[PDB]
């Protein structure tokens, strides 16, 4: 009945800097035997999770020196002393002392970049798409950083709320997310109304992309 928070969720890196992720226990993670089992995982996407540290401090095969793992009571860290470009990766940390074991709940690495704001179109749903009884509307968000963004739909000026999907992409090698937001209607309501708009906030200021169907 133990809960591992790891910090911070997302990490954004520099290729060469160090870098370092904290995990800490509810409980106490000393073993009656003296030792403190505390594990260290890396998981890249599409793969499994693989240990790179275990009790607190001893590093598993195959991993590079530049991970470390320190601490002890209820505070540990990873630390990595320079990132290169394969550590971008989810890292997970995992008390191993009580039965049957806990995970954090998981670390994300991203590559630190400068602000970029997103340039933001706007698509109706197509005339093929309307003879099906449904409309789609996509509101696209290219190559922005960082990946926070909040995008907003209204249809005649009334604010939606469901109705609509997002989806990002990772993060690509000039370091930016891409982001859709895609509103359903059926073609009835769709045919009902006139301005669709999807407004944009990020760090640029607040951008609005619209169009008058009907």
Same mark, same amino acid.
């Given at each position: 009945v133990k809960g591992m928070t790891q910090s911070p969720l997302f990490l954004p890196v520099t290729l060469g800097q160090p870098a370092s992720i904290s995990c800490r226990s509810?409980?106490? /993670? $000393?073993?009656s035997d003296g030792n403190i089992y505390l594990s260290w995982f890396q998981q890249r996407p599409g793969q499994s999770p693989r240990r /790179?540290? #275990?009790? $607190? %401090?001893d590093r598993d095969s195959g991993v590079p020196d530049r991970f470390s793992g320190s601490g002890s009571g209820t505070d540990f860290t990873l630390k990595i002393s320079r990132v290169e470009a394969e550590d971008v990766a989810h890292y997970y940390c995992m008390q191993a002392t009580h039965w049957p074991g806990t995970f954090g709940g998981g670390t994300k690495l991203t590559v630190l970049r400068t602000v970029a704001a997103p340039s933001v179109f706007l698509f109706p749903p197509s005339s093929e798409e309307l003879q099906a009884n449904k409309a789609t509307l996509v509101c696209l968000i290219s190559d %922005? #950083?960082?990946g926070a963004v909040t995008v907003a739909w209204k249809a005649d000026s009334s604010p939606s709320k469901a109705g609509v999907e997002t989806t990002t992409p990772s993060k690509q090698s000039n370091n930016k997310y891409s982001l859709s937001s895609v509103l359903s209607l059926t073609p009835e309501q769709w045919k009902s109304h006139r301005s669709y708009s999807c407004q944009v906030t990020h760090e640029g200021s607040t951008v609005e992309k619209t169009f008058a169907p009907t």
């Open positions: 509810s409980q106490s /993670l $000393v073993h /790179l540290i #275990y009790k $607190v %401090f %922005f #950083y960082p």
